[PDB]
């Protein structure tokens, strides 16, 4: 293998430059199933990867595991293999009264309440998403008629609240702060989308949206 | 007036809900003239305000002055007067060799190297721009054929040490900022300015929309000096862009 | 199950109060096999659990996955299920030239270069191991004739910049970690890993006992590459050691 | 111009080595009016400057604008032009029961609750005034029979309280922390005086005091 | 003298490689009295030192004074003279209901609420005791039948509580954080033991325990 | 006694409200002898106290010992006994090449590189000296014809790494202090000492007056070694100065 954890080689990617990075293997398979020529590449610890194609171009789908630490490994090694655009999809609850279950959330930037993001940039640096990716997710969501909210997500290491709600924070999760910061401070494009499950259909649509967004970014 | 600094009444705004906020009062009239029925509302200190019309809707153009403290006063009072969308327009220097004079920068979020933003949200909170505003600014730039760069900006409470300038009286830069510019450059930061951290953070945490566009008038990383119109043409384009963006946000 | 992630019921543990917690689920069965009546309890994501018997007492072997967040979930749920003693076992790289491949490291406390630990105790609080556990691990190591090093470990939220690795995509390390490895080396830190800060801090602040042992399978400060059994023999010894230690802690 | 913002040249200062730095242009004119040969030099954005003379020596009066950020620009560029002593005068409220409207406050050091001071020295460094300047302000105040209080001022970026009062803090403003720190850490002398307007006569006397203090420091 | 404060020379130590470091001179004398050939070496400010022998090997006993600052001086200069193992003994109160007056506390690591420890290592570094020393203290305590508790001690600069109690902290004092951190980050072995006097017999036994622990570490 | 450490009763002070606080108890009697009717009050650990008379008023001379923790105890107990004005006197080394042995330093404020001060006021609060005390000390120095330097002092919780000394056992200085001395020098800091941050901060935040004077007995930035009377004459002058200053503060 060309990398320490993923068990992948550059050749395995077949020129892929974009990767979709959900948290678990189950979701990886479901995402890969929506694309062309899905092929399972490897599975080591929390990192299960597949290769697939969109409009004739190779795309990678790889699970990140739980939290910023494991996420940072997957993103770095995928970068080493040639990936330059990362799209994460997840399912989360919402903390705003106007956000309904089934809605889709596109994250513009995250509140950095994690530890790993600090390993890439000091706290003053924004955990901001790439404009092209954010645009692609919003466009994809709109193309399937999804009710979408675009804004800030609070990201922490644990599985201050009322304050985040009062500040307009949409939801909570644990990986976006690390993902967005490590990409925005290293010349990598990153996007984040999530289906609201509380405040598998919402997940299926969020999954479809991330795939259609990927298509726009190839 | 119903505000302690701008010297404006809510009636003066004619129900305007969008404001273009340049830093220099000298640029206010110029921007207002681009629109319909421009009228000078007030002028107190560095807070010069004009009102205009764009496609039937009243719009405000008000200067912020230099720095986050000055900017917070302008933004908070305008918000008290009903403004819900803020578009900052300015001219800036770039810190990336590939960014050229005449190019346009649209900021997605800023590095918070200031103090005022901390009064509106903890450091962990991102100084992020509103999506609709950023989209509007990117589309307006493209419609004009401008070479655009979309990304991160470093917002500093100082023009000198915070931007790691050494051609100063002391020639010294405190530890925190020694080698900081090279770091920001390596992280893909486009430029330095001094008001966005406050503007973006206070708007994003208070349900207000804000965006920022700037024309590059100099690049300290290139040895070629900016053409005689070191500002003019570029400033004009930047103004054109923010007005066109506002037109899509009313 | 009575826990949201491990998919285990308290009854599944058979009253076990000690758990051996490796990071990789692939190593769980191997460890469980060293003991009596090993049985696979569950396997959800990177949380693979087996139950076994040691001198008449039920013991649990459950993987933690990578990182403090993942580890906190495993530890908290196991604690909810009755586990009061945690022994982490792993393989690691060393950062001291005098530490050789095949040697064994027993950690007294860790440098908290993570985020999860902060949710259980402020930074001022030490990520310290329980004395009984550390003693048990040191004695088990000695009983096997292993070359043992007892001291501080650096626990990082990242495998790359936090361990000051430059052979990366960007080749860049943020200021905070530039020159950090040489500093840790000068302070006598033995190695880097990614879960101990969370494990030790949450146990020490919640009345639970925890210890950690690891077999050295590589040393980035030595040019000689690890023998073909870069892991095997050493892993085997490390597993032998933690099981023997557990035997003294029941 | 020899500087980026002020629109001034070294020649414009005619050897001036001391500058009085109030916040607004109106106050600049009033201060310059108390000295000999007052001449308006320039006005760019928040920086309006005048030149005048005291005992035959040139002195500069220049507005700083609002907050530490703009203040830091004015002070640096004036330093580049040769100014080595800075005296700020302002009008503020007081937070101590024994301080009466009309009294004069001379700041020995400031609580650093601003952002700009950190761009010159780490937080452990004191935002302390120069001894000669503080002495000159106290002497000037006493010479006109002003009731004076000497002590600490809290300085922040916004336009913790009861705590400052309990700690003996005299008043609140937004520029002294930056001014004092940037000068005390760069070999420049700085002083701060203020008239109490709540808790234009108090201002007129504070203005006279800063001019008479300047005279003692030439 | 070979050092700035202690007034000692390398020769004075006669090969000593271990030092017992209590806080006051009275305790120094009492400790030295338990060993062979006790000799008072010097007394300068808070640093009073004696030399003695255990199993034919020279050992130093030296007072540290109050707090991390003075402690850091004593430990550094003793290190310069050849000491490589330091054992501190003190008397403290306890904050846990199950800890009784007369019990002995052996510190595994300390909560770093002091200022001096930061002069040796960043806050993330643990103020952890050396394993051999901790083991020697526990063994010595057990050998005289003392009721012993092993765990964390909170160390501050002043002469958050309920929180420390809830986190299992055993007691409070002011020197261990500095001692343990400066030793663990500089290749020096350090141990900490204390007799509980509230929550001279407990002191006499704690004193005996530190001497017997020293014997095991020569 | 009515205090837990000094072993003094309020009656012992004879109503004194000013105290001269040197660090070394050995220097207490020397200072007390300069005044009228000197008498040894007590001596407990490094807290040696004497009482004297100056122009009819009772004055106290009490040692503080080394470091902020020790100093806070002395100051707080003396304050409990009625002392409202504290004058610290000491001998120090300088870090500025232009400051010579024999010169006198009067401190306006200190860099808080300690921990004890933080218990009395947050870091943002300045470790500033009282104006009356500083004026009194500057005037007393001038009256004696001493070459005086008035400015900032760096107060450290350590004599070694905090003062960036490398001639130590480890020869190592933690990141925070690497290159710190050159920084302090560039900022015009006059010297290093270890008690002022605590003394000045606790007095300034509690309505008490405090000042500090010190005689330079060495300069690590000059290669010339201090004359055989490396302390004597200078110490004598420093003592003379603080007594004369106290005379103006009663």
Curated annotation (Swiss-Prot), chains A, D, E:
Subcellular location(s): the record lists:
Cytoplasm
The reaction(s) this protein catalyses: uridine + phosphate = alpha-D-ribose 1-phosphate + uracil
What is the top EC class of this enzyme, as a single word?
Answer: transferase
Pathway involvement of the protein, from the record: Pyrimidine metabolism; UMP biosynthesis via salvage pathway; uracil from uridine (phosphorylase route): step 1/1
This protein's superkingdom?
Bacteria
A single GO BP annotation from the record? nucleotide catabolic process
Q: Does the record bear Transferase in its keywords?
A: yes
Q: What is its main location?
A: cytoplasm
Identify the keywords attached in UniProt to this record, alphabetized. Cytoplasm, Glycosyltransferase, Transferase
- According to its UniProt record, the EC number is 2.4.2.3
- What cellular component GO annotations does this protein have? cytosol
Q: Report the SS bond pairs.
A: none
Question: What InterPro entries does its record include?
Answer: Nucleoside_phosphorylase_CS, Nucleoside_phosphorylase_d, Nucleoside_phosphorylase_sf, Uridine_phosphorylase
Tell me which family the UniProt entry assigns to this protein: Belongs to the PNP/UDP phosphorylase family.
Quaternary structure, per UniProt, is:
Homohexamer.
Mind telling me what this protein is named? Uridine phosphorylase
Gene source species: Salmonella typhimurium (strain LT2 / SGSC1412 / ATCC 700720)
Q: What is the lineage of its organism?
A: Bacteria, Pseudomonadati, Pseudomonadota, Gammaproteobacteria, Enterobacterales
Q: Which gene encodes it?
A: udp
